[PDB]
Amino acid sequence: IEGGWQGMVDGWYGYHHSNEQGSGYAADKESTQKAIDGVTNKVNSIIDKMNTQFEAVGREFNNLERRIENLNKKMEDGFLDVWTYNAELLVLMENERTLDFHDSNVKNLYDKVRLQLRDNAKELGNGCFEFYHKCDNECMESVKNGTYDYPQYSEEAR
Amino acid sequence: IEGGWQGMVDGWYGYHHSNEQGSGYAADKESTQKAIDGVTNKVNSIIDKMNTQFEAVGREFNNLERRIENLNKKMEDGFLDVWTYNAELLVLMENERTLDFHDSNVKNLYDKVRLQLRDNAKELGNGCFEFYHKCDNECMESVKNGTYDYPQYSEEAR
Amino acid sequence: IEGGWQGMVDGWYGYHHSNEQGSGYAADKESTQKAIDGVTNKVNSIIDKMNTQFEAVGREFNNLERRIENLNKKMEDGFLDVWTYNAELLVLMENERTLDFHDSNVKNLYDKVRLQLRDNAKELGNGCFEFYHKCDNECMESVKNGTYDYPQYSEEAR
Amino acid sequence: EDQICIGYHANNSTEQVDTIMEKNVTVTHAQDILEKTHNGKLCDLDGVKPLILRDCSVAGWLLGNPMCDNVPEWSYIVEKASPANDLCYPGDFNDYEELKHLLSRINHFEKIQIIPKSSWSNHEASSGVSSACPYLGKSSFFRNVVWLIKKNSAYPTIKRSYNNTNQEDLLVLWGIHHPNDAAEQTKLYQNPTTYISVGTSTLNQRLVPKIATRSKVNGQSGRMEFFWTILKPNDAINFESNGNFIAPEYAYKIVKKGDSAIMKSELEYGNCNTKCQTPMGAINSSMPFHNIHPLTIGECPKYVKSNRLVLATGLRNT
Amino acid sequence: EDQICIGYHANNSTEQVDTIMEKNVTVTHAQDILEKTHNGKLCDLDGVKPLILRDCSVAGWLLGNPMCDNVPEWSYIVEKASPANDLCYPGDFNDYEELKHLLSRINHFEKIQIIPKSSWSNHEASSGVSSACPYLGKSSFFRNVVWLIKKNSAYPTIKRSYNNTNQEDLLVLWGIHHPNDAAEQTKLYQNPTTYISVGTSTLNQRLVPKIATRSKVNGQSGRMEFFWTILKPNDAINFESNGNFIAPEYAYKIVKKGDSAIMKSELEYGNCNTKCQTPMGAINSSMPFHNIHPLTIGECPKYVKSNRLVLATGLRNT
Amino acid sequence: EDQICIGYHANNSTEQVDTIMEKNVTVTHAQDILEKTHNGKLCDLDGVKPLILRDCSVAGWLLGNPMCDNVPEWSYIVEKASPANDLCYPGDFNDYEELKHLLSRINHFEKIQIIPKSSWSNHEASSGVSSACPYLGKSSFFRNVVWLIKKNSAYPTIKRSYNNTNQEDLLVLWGIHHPNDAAEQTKLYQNPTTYISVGTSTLNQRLVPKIATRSKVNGQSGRMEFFWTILKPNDAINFESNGNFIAPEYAYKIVKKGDSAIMKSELEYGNCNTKCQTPMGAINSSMPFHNIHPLTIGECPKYVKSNRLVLATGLRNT
Ligand SMILES: *[C@@H]1O[C@H](CO)[C@@H](O[C@@H]2O[C@H](CO)[C@@H](O)[C@H](O)[C@H]2NC(C)=O)[C@H](O)[C@H]1NC(C)=O
Ligand SMILES: *[C@@H]1O[C@H](CO)[C@@H](O[C@@H]2O[C@H](CO)[C@@H](O)[C@H](O)[C@H]2NC(C)=O)[C@H](O)[C@H]1NC(C)=O
Ligand SMILES: *[C@@H]1O[C@H](CO)[C@@H](O[C@@H]2O[C@H](CO)[C@@H](O)[C@H](O)[C@H]2NC(C)=O)[C@H](O)[C@H]1NC(C)=O
Ligand SMILES: *[C@@H]1O[C@H](CO)[C@@H](O)[C@H](O)[C@H]1NC(C)=O
Ligand SMILES: *[C@@H]1O[C@H](CO)[C@@H](O)[C@H](O)[C@H]1NC(C)=O
Ligand SMILES: *[C@@H]1O[C@H](CO)[C@@H](O)[C@H](O)[C@H]1NC(C)=O
C-alpha cells in the first residue's frame, strides 16, 4: 500500500472501485465497527481500571519531626516515580499495539478479497486488483460484503 | 476460517482431510507442543516473578499518633492502587497477546501448507484446499509432517 | 525459512541471489535502518523515562521507634517488589515484542517481493524464488530496490 | 481495465502520538488521558464547604485570637503558608499537629460556654490581658480562655468541674502561664510554687510552670502553653490549680466521622464544587492522571510528572 | 473432490476471559491467578503456633490481670478488637505500642520470679488490692507486680537491686500509683512527697506521682501507670522509692530474633498450618494475588481490589 | 535455474535473552539495563566531599570526645555501624536522631567560641574531668562543653546570655549532670536542689537532675544528658542554673539548604566522584536499575532484586 484516502469518510477501513459505470469509495462497515469497538474498549480499560479512592495529602509535621516528614516525602515521590514510569510506558506500548492492529485489519481485508478473486485478477501490488474481465456494480457489491461468484467469470481471463 | 472443531481432541492446532478412503482429524503435534509450552511458560512467568517476602501488616498506633497511622494507610492503599491497576491491565494485555498468538499459529500452519500445494489445489477460502487431482492417505500424511512431493501430481491439474 | 546467514554482515535483513554471473549477499538498507531505529528508540524509551530524582535512604530510628522503622521497611521493600516485578516483566514482554517485530519485517520483505514476481517465479518455500527464465544482475538489482519490470519477462515461463 | 482497491481512512488531523519504537507519528483521532487543567479556586468537596481561615492559624482560630476574625461543618481546612497571626501571646500548643489532623474534617462543630467568666468569685477574672494581644489597639487576650490572676493579695486553690451533659464529644482547651521571674510569679499569683492538675476518666495531668529568661516576642518574654483533650459524653473534667492557670470558658461540641488534611494555599473560595481539590485549584476526576500538584484532597487522579499522555485511537496519516 | 482443512480445537468449556479490546470472550482452557479462598481459622505460621489472648490485652496478660486467664514461643499475637479486660485498675502503660511490637514475635519466653513477695520486711506487701481487680469476687490485683503500702505508720526508703544472672535478656515491669488526694497519699504511704528512681546501665528514671481529681473508672479514681525496660545479661536494675511504688515480682526471660505484628481477629485456632495468615482466615500462597484482607502476616500474595483475575490459556470457542 | 532468497543476519554471538513464552533464546545483539557494578569506595557526591567520621559518632564528634580525632561543608555523613567511641562519659543525647538528620547535609559549618572557659569567675571551670574520658591516659572531658563545679564551698546562681551576632543560624549544645546520690550532689554543687533553665525566643526549658543508682558504664555510674537548639540570628540564649550545668563553650555556625542521610559503611574515601553512592561503593546512574544495595544516596537507579535484566536488540541465531 501507498497512503490513506481523504475520499473515504464514512469509515476506517474500506474499498475504492473503478469500473465502466464509474468510481466510488465505500467503508467496510463490519470490520470498521469491530475495530472501533476494540480501540474504544481499550481506552475505557486504561481509564476505568484506575481505583481512585478518597485520600488527603499534606505536610503534617513539625521542626522536630523532620525524619518522618522525610519518610512521607520518600513514599510520596516513590509512587510518583512508579506511576509516571508506568503511565509513560503503558501509553507508548499500547500505541505500538493500536497501530499494529490497524495494519493487520487493513491487510486481513485485502487478504479476504485476494482469496475470492484467485487468478482472474491481477495483483498490482499497491492494494488494488485489476480485473482481466469486466465488473459491473453487481460484481463489485458482491466482492465487498463477500458474496462473490467465481463460477461465472471463471474462464474469461484466457 | 469459520469456527473450531469439536472433533479435534488430541491437540490445539491441526488438520481434517477427506479423500476417497475416508475422512479424519489430526493434530499438528509439533506446532501444538511449541504453543502449549509458550503459553504455560507465560503463566509461570506472571506467577513466579512475584517476590513475596515475609511481611506483617497491622494498626500499631494510638489516639495521639493519628498522623502516622494516616501515613501508614496512605502507603498501604497506595500500593493497593498500584497492584490492582497493573494486575488488571497485565491480564487484559497478555490475553490480547495469547489470542493473537493463537491466530498467528493457525494461519502460519495454513500458510506452510499453501506453499507446498501451489496451483494444483484450490483455495476454497474457508481454511481448506480442494485437490484437482486425487490424494490417497500417503499423499495426505506427507502434507501434514511436510514431506510433500510436488514432482509427482505436478501436471494432472491441466 | 530455515535459518540465518553468516554471510550477510552489512545489515539485519536482506537478499541472496544466484544467477549465471554468480552469487552475492545484500542488505535491504531501507528496512534495516527503519528497524534499527525502532529497536534503538525502544531501548532508549525504557531507559530515559525513568525519573530518578535525588533521594537519601537510611535507618534513622532508635530502640523505642521500632514501629516507624518497620513502617519505613514496609514501604522500602514495598517498592522493591513493585519495581522488581515490573522490570522483570517489562523485559520479558518487550522481548517477545522485538522478536515478533523481526519475524514480521523478514516476512514483509519476502511478501513485497512475491507480489512483483507473480507466476513467472517458483516459490521454493524456503525463502527463495527460482526463476523459470533467466535473470542478469540488472534484473536482480531491480527486484531489491523494487523497480521490477514484469512487462519484459512476462511470457517466457510458458 | 476494471479495478477494486483496499485502503484506509485519512483526514486533516495534525495530532501526534508516540510509540515504543517511533516518535511524533501523525494520527487520525486521539485521546489525552492527562488532566492538566484547573480552575484556580478553592471549592466545596462533594457538597461540603471548606473552612477557610483567612489569616489565622488553626490554634489562633480555636483560642479566639483577638487579631483574628460559626461554621457547623467542613470537609477540609485552608490556612495560608504563614498565617499573619497565630499565638498573639507568645507560647506553644501541645500536640498541635495531632489536633490539626483531628480537626481536618468535622461533621458537626458548635462552640459552647462551659465555665462563665462571671463565675470566678475569689480570683481576678478580667485583668488577664496583654498588648501582645491587641483588640482595636487595646490590650486583650484569646477570647475563649480566661487568664486568672490574684484578688486581694490572695490566690485560693481553684477546684472546678464540668460534666459533659451533651450528646456529643467535647473539645476542651486550657493553658498555663510561664512567667519570667519569681517576682512576677508572686506579683501575679502570690504563691511561689504552683501547679495545675487536670483529670478526666482518661487524662491524668499535672502541669508546673517553667520560669526562664527568654527573648521578647511581641514585646513579651513570658509564655503561654496550651493543652487540649476530648471529653466524652457523661464524663467530667476536674481542674485544680493554685496559679498560672489559663482557664477554659468556651469549649466545642464535636462530631468526627472521616478524616482529611490541612491545605496550605493562597487562593480563595469560588462558590464551586469538585471531587478533587488542589492547592492551585479544583480539577476534574474523570482522567486517570494529572500533573497539577501532588498535595491533593479528594478522589483524585494519580499525580504524575508528565507533560503529555496521549493515546492513539485513529490511524496514521498522509 | 479430495480436501484437506486447517483448523483449531474447540470444546464444551463455558469459561470467559477479558481483553484490552473485547470483553466476555469464551475460551477453551483458562487460569485464575487470584486467590479468593480462605479457611476461616487462625493457624500456625510455618510450624510456630500463635499466642492467642482469649479476651486479654497484651498489657493485662503481661501484668497478670486477675480477671484474665505458659507458652515458650510464638510467631504472632491475636487480640480481639476490644478485649474484655485490659487494665483492671484504671491507668496507663508507657511505650505500650512499642512493647506490643517488640512482643509480636518471640523466640523464647519464660516467666521468672525476681523479687519474692515475702522479701518485703519493712513494707506491707499483701494489702495492695482493689475491687476493680476482682478474683472470684474478692479484691485482688495484677499477679505479677506488688502494690506496697506502709507498715506501722512508716514507709522507709526502699533500695532493691536485681542482677541479670541468666543468659537471656530480661523484660522487667514496674509501676506507680497516682492517688487522688494528699490525704490518700499520707494514708497509704505516710510520706507527703515521694519519688521512684529506677536505673540500669541505660535507664535513668525518676517518677513522681500525680495527684488529680479524676472520674471513677471501675469505681476507682486513682491510677496505676506502668513502665518497662529490657535488662541485658550481667546488668543490674536498681529500684529506689519512698512511696507509690508498684514493685516487680515476676519478670520475663526474652529471646527476640525476627519481628511480626499483633493481629486483631475474632476467629479461633484450627490446629492448622499456613504460610500467610489473615484476620479472616489462612490462605494459600501459590497465586500472585489475593483479595481477602489487607492486614496479612506471612509470605503473602499481593493484596488487590479485584473480583476476578483470569488469564486465557486455551483459545476462542464456537 | 536463477534464484533470489530473502533472509536475515546471524553471527557468532552466544548471548541469551528471555521471553514471556520461551527461555534462554540466543540473540545477535543485546542490552543489559541492570547496573551490578560498584567501585568499592566512598566518593564525592556531585563535587561535594562527604564528612567521614573515622570512628566517632556524630554526638562524640560534635561534643568533642577526647578519644576521637574542620570541614566547611558536606553532602552526606559516614559513620561505621558501631563507632568505637560515642559518649565517653555515659549518658544520653536528646533528640539525637533529629539532629543527625539535620546535620546530614550541611552547606556551611564553622565552630566558634561563644562562652570562654576563662570567663567563669565564681565557679570552678577546670575540674570537670573524668577517667571515662581519657586524653593520653589523663582524665579529660568533651572539649566543647564545660563541666562546672563549685568554688570555695559555694555555687552561686549562673546567669549567662549569648546574642547571635553572626549572619548565620547557630547550633548550641549544653548538658546536665545526673549524679548518683545526694552526697555527690552537695559534694560537687553544694546546693541540694538544682535546676537549669534555658530560653531563646522559641525555647522554654527547665531541666532538673535525676538522682539514681545505676550500673557503671566506663567506670562511671553518674550520667550526662545533652540538649541542643538552633539559635536564629539576632536571637539570644539565656542560661540560668544553680548546679549540674554542663555549659557550652563552643557552638556552630550553620547553613542548611538540602537534606540527606547518615550512611553506615565500613569503606574508605577514594578521591572519587559519583551521582549515586552506596554503603558498598559508588555506582553509575545511566541504567534504569541496579542490584547493589537498597540504602543509596543520590540520583540513583531503582533498586531491584534481580540478577540479570537483559533486553534483546538483535535477532535469533543459528
Ligand atoms: C456526670 O453526670 C451524669 C449525669 O447525671 C452522671 O451519669 C449518671 O450517673 C448516675 C450514678 O452516679 C446514674 O444513676 C445515671 O444512670 C447516670 N446518667 C446517665 C445519663 O448516664 C455521670 O456519672 C457523671 N459523671 C461523672 C464523671 O461524674
Ligand atoms: C552483676 O553480677 C555479675 C556476675 O558476678 C558481674 O559480673 C562480674 O563482674 C566482676 C567484676 O566486678 C568480674 O570479676 C566478672 O568477670 C564478671 N562476671 C561476668 C560473668 O561477667 C556484674 O558486674 C554485675 N553487674 C552489675 C551491674 O553490678
Ligand atoms: C541581640 O542584639 C541585637 C543587636 O543589637 C539586637 O537587635 C537590635 O535591637 C535594637 C532594639 O533593641 C534595634 O535598635 C536594632 O534595630 C536591632 N539590630 C538589628 C541588627 O536587628 C537584638 O534585639 C538582641 N536580641 C535579643 C534577643 O536581646
Ligand atoms: C517532536 O515534536 C516536538 C513538538 O512539536 C518537537 O519539539 C521535537 O523536536 C520532536 N522530537 C523528535 C524526536 O522528533
Ligand atoms: C459479561 O458477563 C458478566 C457475567 O456473566 C455480565 O454480568 C455482564 O453483563 C457482561 N458484561 C459485558 C460488558 O458484556
Ligand atoms: C538457562 O541457562 C542458564 C544459564 O546458562 C542455566 O543455568 C539454566 O539451566 C537454563 N534454564 C532453562 C530453563 O533452560
Numbering used by the authors:
A (entry chain B), B (entry chain B), C (entry chain B): 10 to 167
D (entry chain A), E (entry chain A), F (entry chain A): 10 to 19, 19A, 20 to 28, 31 to 35, 35A, 36 to 53, 53A, 54 to 77, ...
Pull verbatim passages from the article behind this deposition.
One crystal form of the MP HA protein was obtained at pH 8.5, and two crystal forms of the HP HA protein were obtained at pH 6.6, all above the low pH thresholds for conformational changes for the two proteins. In contrast, conformational changes by HP HA were triggered at higher pH (∼0.4 pH units) being first observed at pH 5.8, reaching a midpoint at pH 5.7, and being complete at approximately pH 5.4. The most significant differences occur between the two crystal forms of the HP HA protein, specifically, in the B loops of the HA2 stalk domain along with parts of the vestigial esterase sub-domain (not including the 110-helix) and the F' fusion sub-domain. Both crystal forms were grown in identical solutions at pH 6.6, 0.9 pH units above its activation pH of 5.7, but display different crystal-packing interactions in the B loop region. We also observed the two forms of the B loop, vestigial esterase sub-domain, and F' fusion sub-domain in the two different crystal forms of the HP A/chicken/Hong Kong/YU562/2001 (H5N1) HA protein, although both H5N1 HA crystals were grown in identical solutions at pH 6.6 (0.9 pH units above its pH of activation). While the two HP H5N1 HA structures suggest that the observed differences in the B loops, vestigial esterase sub-domain, and F' fusion sub-domain in the prefusion structures reported here are due to differing crystallographic environments, it is possible that upon low-pH activation the H5N1 HA protein favors the “out” form of the B loop and pivoting of the F' fusion sub-domain similar to that which is observed when the H2 HA protein is exposed to acidic pH. In HP HA, K216 makes a hydrogen bond with neighboring RBD backbone carbonyl N210. Compared to P221 in MP HA, S221 in HP HA forms a hydrogen bond to the D241 side-chain in an adjacent monomer across the RBD-RBD interface. I115 in the HP HA does not form this hydrogen bond, and the stabilizing capping interaction is therefore absent.
The hemagglutinin (HA) surface glycoprotein promotes viral entry through its receptor binding and membrane fusion functions, and mutations in HA have been shown to modulate the pathogenicity, host range specificity, transmissibility, and pandemic potential of influenza viruses. HA is synthesized as a trimeric HA0 protein that must be activated for membrane fusion by post-translational cleavage into a high-energy HA1/HA2 complex. Upon internalization, the virus is exposed to progressively lower pH values until a threshold is reached that triggers HA to undergo irreversible conformational changes that mediate membrane fusion. Here, we provide biochemical and x-ray crystallographic evidence that naturally occurring amino-acid variations at the interface of the vestigial esterase and fusogenic stalk domains alter HA acid stability for highly pathogenic H5N1 influenza, resulting in a shift in the threshold pH required to activate HA protein structural changes that cause membrane fusion.
